[PDB]
Symmetry: C3
């Protein structure tokens, strides 16, 4: 009975969340930063382990109802961990450790997204697939935002550039993950939302990278930021287009065409602002 | 040829065993405590990594004989790692690190249990599944006492509660894992053996939590211990109940209810005296 | 679309590689030996992480060329990390840290090989499997040399014995992995090539261990070295034989008989010279 298996999943989830919180609460009472990073590491490893366990267990589910429960559980684990890591990250003074917290957030997000994507591939109901797609989008945006806020506190362009790199992958993979699942929708309504979700991800990543990039002093890194931004846009456009290639009603695609145009105009404007501020 | 795959699995196991003890042996002559904790984590990683590798290798096996060896290998790894961690944990003076050691064992035990469950799910023969049931029970019991033994030498009570929770999950997860495997049996005698295993785990876990509670100083903790105990009891009973539902013969059922009756009252017995030890 | 999954794989591979080079670059300018080791741990985990992600994704591919891309990607990941680690290991003065470095190199190679082995099992065309066998063999040979070069820099015979062990495990598993993959060849031309790969691996591992053993002063470790060499030879010979039973043409078998003989003669020569060096 998967109900019992889903219960096994819940048990793992609640404990993981509980452990994460207490460890976080413990970290607030510690002084030396190396140990604070360890608290983040413990949170990161626990979340990664639990996600891996739940996924492997989730493959043994035939019921979408229970598969949605596993995905629902997995997403909250990621979000909870990301928040815990973020607030702990606010207490770091060394960019190296702040970079590691950023690294941890990205890797959790990638792990969670890919896990959800792999599970979501087995859904026949579009409603549940839309929820999985929604979860991925929310995870990507959350992780990207956390990284941005942390990035403002770096002094080294190299570390800010490293943050930019991490954001780009979160954007790319999330889009790709969404694309694979969105390709499997027969309902036109849900397909339009994926385009909307993708567009928002593109806008978020592009804006964040711009804002970090605007704080660079070295031309070499700003050029890397510019390179990164358009690649996100080009990826997003293909995703929207390919999904649009398989939809028949133009009403929704005209908005999809609008989405493509907005992504371009936002990206072109962002890059344009960056080049104008270069020497 | 699975013989070769089993040979790869065996090689992985022996190497893992070799590394774990050596690291443990090294740790006994080092002080610091940080390095001993590092050794424990390394041991945890070795066992977890090896178990994950072995499972993945074991999943491509069709012959049950080789799979039982794989299940046995996983069981042996845990016991060696657990025993090693326990003896090393006794060499720490800072209770926090012993609490961390408890975390490693619990997470380690869970990894092994689910792995065995996943392998055992592919068995058609009740005999080999029965070996897995005993193994899972033995892993939980070994880990639970190990956690129990460690809790007695520390000074901060809440970590006993942290230990108590960890104990609860081992009991909790083991029961469900046992339930899933027992569910695939057609012969009534073996189901009774599984119920007995469940009963032993429950009493084992419940007694431990009780023994920790008398060593607690503040009132809220025993209520949590009480909370922990009862959740274990109701489920185990429910698991036994649902398994008893699958028996047609009148003889065995009285023992299943006997198991239920013993689990309830003994649990009741443990808890109420705590109220006598409660303020 | 498998292209999209392969596209996701591409992002992960380049990024892991991106991070690996950067971590290596940072490590070379730092002074605390632990921080270099810390970077190595990061290199190991990231390399391990990407493989863990890629493998699960690659299993969802139907086109074999894309599977070969994944095998290639995994292979390139391992080599890059190993090379990076070696460069860092040369900067260690303490053998203790070097033993850990040896472990990391070994563990990465094992991870990649097993991943490829699991992936390679899904190829029906002998051509790509021959590439898969080749990739595994080259990874093994590369890892053996890196460890061998590092072993030359140790002062403690015990740590070299650990290095000898590390070489042995890689040789054995690669040989066994190749055997499993070679078992799936129908063309005798291709089966003979797998035998050749095994023979080269055997001679290489034996050669490394022999040269390391000559630098020992203690008989106890050299006796372990004879043991180490001999176990490898026995495994390789039987592996080649098992492959030979499924060959129908006597011509290729003579090469296998030759291959076995070359392995045997190499081992006795190696062992005998070691016996001449005992007191």
């Amino acid at each position: 009975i998967e109900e019992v298996v889903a219960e096994m999943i819940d048990i793992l989830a609640e404990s993981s969340k509980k452990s994460i919180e207490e460890l976080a609460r413990a970290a607030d009472n510690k002084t030396t930063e190396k140990a604070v990073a360890e608290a983040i590491e413990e949170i990161a490893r626990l979340a990664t382990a639990a996600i891996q366990l739940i996924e492997a267990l989730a493959k043994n589910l035939a019921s979408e109802e229970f598969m949605a429960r596993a995905i629902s559980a997995i997403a909250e684990l990621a979000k909870k961990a990301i928040e815990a890591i973020y607030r702990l990250a606010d207490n770091h003074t060394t960019d190296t450790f702040m970079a590691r917290a950023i690294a941890a957030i990205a890797n959790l997000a990638v792990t969670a997204i890919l896990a959800i994507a792999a599970l979501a591939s087995n859904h026949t109901t579009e409603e549940f697939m839309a929820r999985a797609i929604s979860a991925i989008a929310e995870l990507a945006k959350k992780a990207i935002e956390a990284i941005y806020r942390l990035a403002d506190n770096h002094t080294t362009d190299k570390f800010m550039a490293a943050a930019i790199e991490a954001i780009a992958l979160l954007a790319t993979l999330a889009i790709l993950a969404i694309a694979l699942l969105a390709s499997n929708h027969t309902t036109e309504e849900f397909m339009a939302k994926a385009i909307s979700a993708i567009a928002e991800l593109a806008k978020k990543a592009i804006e964040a990278i711009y804002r970090l990039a605007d704080n660079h002093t070295s031309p070499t890194y700003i050029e890397k930021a510019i390179e990164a931004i358009e690649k996100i846009a080009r990826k997003a456009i293909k995703a929207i287009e390919m999904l649009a290639k398989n939809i028949t009603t133009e009403e929704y695609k005209e908005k999809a065409k609008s989405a493509i145009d907005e992504i371009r105009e936002k990206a072109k404007e962002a890059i344009k602002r960056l080049e104008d501020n270069r020497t």
